[PDB]
Amino acid sequence: KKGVVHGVATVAEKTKEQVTNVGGAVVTGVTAVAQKTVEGAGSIAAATGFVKKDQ
Amino acid sequence: KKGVVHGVATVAEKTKEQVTNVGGAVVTGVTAVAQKTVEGAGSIAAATGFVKKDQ
Amino acid sequence: KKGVVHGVATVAEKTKEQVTNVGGAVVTGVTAVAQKTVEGAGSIAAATGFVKKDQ
Amino acid sequence: KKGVVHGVATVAEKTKEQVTNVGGAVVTGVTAVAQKTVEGAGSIAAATGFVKKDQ
Amino acid sequence: KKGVVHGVATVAEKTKEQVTNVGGAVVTGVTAVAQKTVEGAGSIAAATGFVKKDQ
Amino acid sequence: KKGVVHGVATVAEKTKEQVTNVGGAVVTGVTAVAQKTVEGAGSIAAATGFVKKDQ
Amino acid sequence: KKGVVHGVATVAEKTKEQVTNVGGAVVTGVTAVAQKTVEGAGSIAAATGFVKKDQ
Amino acid sequence: KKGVVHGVATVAEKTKEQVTNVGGAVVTGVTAVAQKTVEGAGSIAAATGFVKKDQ
Amino acid sequence: KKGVVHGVATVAEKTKEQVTNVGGAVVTGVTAVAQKTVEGAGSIAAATGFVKKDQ
Amino acid sequence: KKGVVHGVATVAEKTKEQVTNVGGAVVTGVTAVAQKTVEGAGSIAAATGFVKKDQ
Questions:
Q1: Which residue from I minimizes the CA distance to C29?
Q2: N or C: which end of chain A has fewer CB within 10 A?
């Protein structure tokens, strides 16, 4: 076989899960957050996949 | 087989899940948030997939 | 076989999970956060995959 | 076979898990955080994969 | 076979797990944090994979 | 002060929450269930407060 | 002060939370269940407070 | 002071939390369950407070 | 002071938490379960407080 | 002071935590279970407080 990509690719066979991202956010997984009190200014309480590039 | 992509591709066979994103947000997964009190200015309480690029 | 990529690629066969990211955040895994009180200004309480590049 | 990459690639066969990242965050693994009280200003309480490059 | 990379590559066969990172954070492994009280300003309580390059 | 009860009482002062039960069920708390597929005959999928006394 | 109870009592002062139960179930706390597939006959998947006295 | 109980009592002062139970189940605490697949016949997957007295 | 109990009592002053149980189950504490696959017939996967008296 | 109990009592002053149990299960403590695969028939995977008296 032959393949040429510029990116971003994701090429496969017999594949149970696939995610391609440029951005941006993708949530595909099981996630449970239980929480009782959030205070403070300002605290990232429960972050799973996170990116902060403030300018 | 032969394939040429510019991106972003996601090419496969026999594949249970697929996500392609440029952006942007995609939520495809099970997610449960239970929460009782959020305060503060300003706190990211429960973030799963998150991207902040303020300018 | 033959392959030429510019990146970012992810090329495979017989592959159960795949993630390609440029960004950005991708959450595909099982995650449970149980939490009772968050205070302080400002404290990253429970971070799993995290990136902070403030300017 | 033949392959030429610019990076970042991840090329394989018969492969159970794959992650490619430039960024950014990717969470694909099982993670359990149980927590009772977070205080202080500001303390990284429970960080699993973490990167802080404040300028 | 023949291969030329610029990096960062990860090239393999018959491979159970793969991670490629430039960044950034990747969490793919089992992780359990149980915690009862975090105080102090500011103390990295429980860090698994961590990088701090404040300027 | 003086108090005589037969039960079930719940006597207090300055008290944020109170529940008295004989029965029976009382749900006063925050609860989030997210769920994707339930099968089997017959499986208690997600039970929070539960009592089964079949005769 | 003086108090005589038969039970079940719960007597207090300056008290943030109170539960009295004879039964029966009481749910007053924060609870998050995220779930993707339940099978089998019959499996208690996620039980928090649970009592089974089948006869 | 003077007190005579038959049980079950719970007598106090200046008390943040109180639970009295005869039964039965009481859930007052923070709880997060994240789960991806439950199979088998029949397996208690994730039990927190549990009592099984089948006859 | 004077006290006579038959049991089960729990008598106190200046007390942050109290639990009285006859039964039965009481869950008042922070609990996080993250889980990816449960199989087998039948395996107690993750049990925190547990009692099995099958007859 | 004077006290006569039949049991089970728990009598105190200035006391941060209290548990009285006859049964039965009580979970009041911080607990984190992260888990990736459970198999076998039948294996107690992760048990914290456990009692099995099958007849």
A1: I36
A2: C
I41 is in an annotated binding site: no
Name which of H20, I40, D19 is nearest A20 in CA terms. Answer: D19
Q: How many domains does chain A have?
A: 1
Q: Does F49 touch chain H (CB under 8 A)?
A: yes
CA distance D38 to C42: 10
Residue of A nearest to D29 (CA): A29
Which residues from chain J sit within 8 angstroms of residue I35, using beta carbons? Answer: 33-35, 38
Enumerate the known binding-site residues of A for Cu cation: 6
CA distance C31 to C39: 22
Range(s) of the domain holding residue I36 = 1-55
Buried b (16+ CB within 10 A) or exposed e, G7-42: bbbbbbbebebbbbbbbbbbbbbbbbbbbbbbbbeb
- Among B22, F35, H42, J35, smallest CA distance to I39 is for H42
Phi-psi region of F16 (alpha: psi -120 to 50; beta: other; left: phi over 0): alpha
Resolution in A: 2.7
Residue E27 domain-assigned (yes or no)? yes
Sign of the C-alpha dihedral, residues I42, J49, I27, D37?
Answer: negative
Q: Does I27 touch chain C (CB under 8 A)?
A: no
Cis peptide before J49 (omega within 30 of 0): no
Residue type, B37: T
Method: cryo-EM
Does a structural domain hold residue E39?
yes
Which strands make up the sheet holding C25-27, listed edge to edge? B25-27, A25-27, C25-27, D25-27, E25-27
| A50 and D CB contact within 8 Å | yes
From CA J11, how far away is CA C20, in angstroms rounded? 59
Domain presence at residue D33: yes
What spatial distance separates the first Cα and last Cα of chain I, rounded to whole Å?
45
In terms of Cα–Cα distance, which of D31, A9, B12 is closest to C22? A9
